[PDB]
Amino acid sequence: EMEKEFEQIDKSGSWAAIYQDIRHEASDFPSRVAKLPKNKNRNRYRDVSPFDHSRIKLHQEDNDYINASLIKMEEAQRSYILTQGPLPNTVGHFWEMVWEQKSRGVVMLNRVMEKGSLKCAQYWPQKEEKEMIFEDTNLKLTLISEDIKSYYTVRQLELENLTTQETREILHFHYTTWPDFGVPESPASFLNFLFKVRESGSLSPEHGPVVVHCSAGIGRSGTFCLADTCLLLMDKRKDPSSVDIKKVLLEMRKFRMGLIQTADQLRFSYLAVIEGAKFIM
Numbered sequence: 001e002m003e004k005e006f007e008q009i010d011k012s013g014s015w016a017a018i019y020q021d022i023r024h025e026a027s028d029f030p031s032r033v034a035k036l037p038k039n040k041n042r043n044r045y046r047d048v049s050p051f052d053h054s055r056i057k058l059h060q061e062d063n064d065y066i067n068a069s070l071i072k073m074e075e076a077q078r079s080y081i082l083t084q085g086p087l088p089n090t091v092g093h094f095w096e097m098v099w100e101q102k103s104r105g106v107v108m109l110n111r112v113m114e115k116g117s118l119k120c121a122q123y124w125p126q127k128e129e130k131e132m133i134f135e136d137t138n139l140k141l142t143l144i145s146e147d148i149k150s151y152y153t154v155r156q157l158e159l160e161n162l163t164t165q166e167t168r169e170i171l172h173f174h175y176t177t178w179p180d181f182g183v184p185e186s187p188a189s190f191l192n193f194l195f196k197v198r199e200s201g202s203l204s205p206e207h208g209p210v211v212v213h214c215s216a217g218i219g220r221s222g223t224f225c226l227a228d229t230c231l232l233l234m235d236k237r238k239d240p241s242s243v244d245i246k247k248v249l250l251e252m253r254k255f256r257m258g259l260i261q262t263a264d265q266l267r268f269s270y271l272a273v274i275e276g277a278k279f280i281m
């Protein structure tokens with residue numbers, strides 16, 4: 001049981017040690033498409049690349065590349081697209097991916113500016129009457145409504161394919177209170193946020209996979225998926241305590257490198273799952 005494993009690692013302060021064991025056990029697959037010179041300006045960080053086998057392909061003949069990975073958790077019947085915060089030149093690619101994959105939700109776990117630097121392009125409209133057109137991908141995006149709470153904002157967006165005049169409603173879930181350094185003290189507001197995404201139907205198999213991002217799409221994004229999948233598996237299994245976070249994390253790392261960036265994010269993931277288990281038992 002993970003609650004006892006938590007106290008052990010915590011009392012022994014062995015978080016950096018377990019984290020290193022995970023780093024060394026993690027899969028390594030080719031990422032040849034990401035490293036092509038023509039894709040250099042489509043990557044925010046040169047050391048964060050999608051594996052070729054799990055990368056999302058854009059349906060454009062010219063260049064199909066986006067820094068995005070499909071995480072498929074077979075036992076949990078959950079699938080997530082993890083991607084980097086879009087760049088100024090990839091905002092149109094981002095919304096093309098949302099369109100092509102039939103996603104219903106976008107989950108954003110960063111602020112546009114953190115530590116005085118831009119972590120992400122402003123890829124959604126700030127006002128109802130000022131819609132955005134992505135000329136490169138032939139899409140129009142309109143803010144329909146915005147509901148600002150203390151810890152997160154939910155926005156309803158309309159995405160229109162200008163080529164076919166189909167429209168879809170997209171839900172933007174923006175967690176706004178992750179601190180510049182370290183992790184939240186308590187996982188309560190993060191769990192509340194995760195349950196709000198679930199309640200929307202954005203994580204449901206009727207829809208394409210949810211798009212999850214932070215700046216690189218590996219750290220905070222990793223914590224989001226890890227907590228969701230672990231809590232799901234605890235509902236599904238005859239023995240909820242057979243769920244080993246470490247094993248679940250290593251499975252996800254077959255699909256995208258580097259998920260959970262720090263020993264602090266690992267500790268926070270344990271705490272989120274342990275605490276979330278009380279609201280589920």
Ligand SMILES: COc1ccc(NC(=O)Nc2ccncc2)cc1
Nearest residue numbers: 008009012014015016017018020021
């Ligand atoms: C000398 O380099 C090494 C660094 C780390 C490990 N693994 C390790 O400490 N695992 C561990 C698991 C649970 N509690 C405490 C520790 C082995 C060798």
